[PDB]
A paper describes a structure:
Here, we show that a tyrosine phosphoregulatory system controls the biosynthesis and abundance of Vibrio exopolysaccharide (VPS), an essential biofilm component of the pathogen Vibrio cholerae. The phosphorylation state of the tyrosine autokinase VpsO, mediated by the tyrosine phosphatase VpsU, directly modulates VPS production and also affects the kinase’s own degradation, to regulate VPS production. We found that VpsO and VpsU have respective kinase and phosphatase functions, and we have determined crystal structures of VpsU and the VpsO catalytic domain. We found that the VpsU tyrosine phosphatase controls VPS production through regulation of the VpsO phosphorylation state. Together, our data suggest that the phosphorylation state of the C-terminal tail of VpsO, modulated by autokinase and VpsU phosphatase activity, regulates the functional state of VpsO to control VPS production and biofilm formation in V. cholerae.
We found that the only version of VpsO-503 that we could crystallize was VpsO-503E519A, R522A, R525A, which contains mutations in a conserved ExxRxxR motif in the kinase domain (E519, R522, R525). We determined the structure of VpsO-503E519A, R522A, R525A from x-ray diffraction data at a resolution of 2.9 Å. Two VpsO molecules are present in the asymmetric unit; these molecules dimerize through the α1 helix, which contains the mutated ExxRxxR motif. The kinase domain adopts the expected α/β mononucleotide-binding fold with a seven-stranded β-sheet surrounded by eight α-helices. In contrast, the VpsO-503E519A, R522A, R525A protein used for crystallization lacks the N-terminal extension found in other BY-kinases, and alternatively, its α1 helix is longer at its N-terminus. This helix likely contacts the adenine base of ATP, and it contains two glutamates (E512 and E516) that could coordinate the ribose. Refinement of the VpsO structure revealed unmodeled electron density in the ATP binding site that is consistent with the presence of a phosphorylated tyrosine residue. The phosphate is located in a position similar to that of the β-phosphate of ADP in the Wzc structure. It is coordinated through hydrogen bonding to backbone amides (residues 548–550) in the P-loop and through T552, which are all part of the canonical Walker A motif. In addition, R583 stacks against the tyrosine aromatic ring. The position of the phosphotyrosine suggests that it should inhibit nucleotide binding, and we do not observe ADP in the active site despite its presence at 1 mM in the crystallization buffer.
Author numbering:
A (entry chain B): 508 to 710
B (entry chain A): 504 to 711
The structure:
């Protein structure tokens, strides 16, 4: 049943235009961009690729899958589970060349989550992670980071230290605003600021 | 320089797709007797082919469906599924070069069956006014639950006024941003003053 997949993913794409516009033409200094939600199932992963796909039109961009717990990016580009990714780099198994997947339908570069890692937050709080991000900055104009939810784990409060912009994805049909207000509060009380929302509408 | 071209194809495709949902619903759940349905416009450039696509694709999820390209003059269907222009289709069948089996292309991403216009033919109205064209339609009726036919614009050539005799329903595709209603009212009259009746509109909105 293809036509409804076409409506869902086409809709998902337009729901990210104003966010993609702002980044491309207003805050051009925001080189590393982090997408997150308060809970699972709010459209965060498809908003991430859709954002990265459009930023790929004007800049050499990288999409990184950083939900090392339930990773989806590799799934949605039809990428191998074999394909080495982010954890592979941090663990020094493979190098960046044998890790980036190039979707040259689009020009986008994709760094998948990589093989399983039982220490996801340990890995992400690494100084091998901060070093990896610093190196990717000097190689890419834009980087888009898919993160796991803000209330499930602490990963994303950890990552936000490292990024230039946080975009908060919200299933406006179901997430309640007092929750959002609390998540915004938790970020504010450690430093990070929210630079924009994406309001998906799911059923 | 920017992503306007990328986002505008998506927005155009999304608007085009959404414009065919109510049409498809009506056919799937209200007018189930209308097995062969014809889409057309008054002029070129009104969204008619992608409306014929999405409609067929959408009917495919509930019924065994066939999309036929019958604009033998400026054909688009084959182009939009990434099918070779070589691929035999309607003209091939009418000219008896190929038979029906190694003519139909199956899009197995979607379940839809597609019959392209086929190789070029300089006798287009000649061919469609054939009897073996009607015999081809009679056979396709017994093989498909729905048949969706993309046809030429009404005011360019007369092909579609001829085709309407063979179909159970005519759907008129309209670029409501640009087509003017007295034009539409005139084309409706031309069908009204022969057999055909219009059973529904699809209102595209385009950005020339
Ligand atoms: N693609 C659909 C639904 C969707 C659901 C979940 C999803 O992934 P996650 O919840 O992990 O962000 C992505 C997309 C939409 O955005 O409308
Ligand atoms: N090519 C655009 C718009 C378009 C589509 C079909 C179309 O058909 P026609 O020119 O025959 O009316 C016209 C314009 C789209 O994919 O929606």
């Amino acid at each position: 049943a293809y036509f409804d997949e076409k409506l869902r993913e086409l809709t998902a794409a337009v729901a990210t235009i104003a966010t993609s516009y702002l980044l491309a033409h207003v805050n051009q200094d925001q080189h590393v961009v982090m997408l997150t939600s308060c809970l699972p199932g709010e459209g965060k992963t498809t908003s991430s690729l859709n954002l990265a796909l459009s930023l790929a039109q004007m800049e050499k961009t990288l999409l990184i899958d950083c939900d090392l717990r339930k990773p989806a990016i590799a799934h949605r580009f039809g990428i191998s589970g074999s394909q080495p990714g982010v954890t592979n780099l941090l663990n020094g198994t493979q190098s960046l060349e044998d890790c980036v997947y190039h979707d040259e339908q689009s020009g986008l570069d994709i760094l998948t989550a990589g093989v399983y890692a039982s220490n996801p937050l340990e890995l992400l709080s690494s100084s091998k992670f901060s070093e990896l991000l610093a190196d990717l900055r000097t190689r890419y104009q834009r980087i888009v980071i898919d993160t796991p939810p803000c209330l499930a784990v602490s990963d994303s409060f950890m990552l936000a230290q490292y990024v230039d912009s946080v975009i908060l994805v919200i299933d406006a049909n179901h997430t309640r605003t007092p929750v959002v207000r609390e998540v915004v509060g938790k970020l504010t009380q450690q430093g990070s600021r929210i630079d924009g929302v994406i309001l998906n509408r799911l059923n």
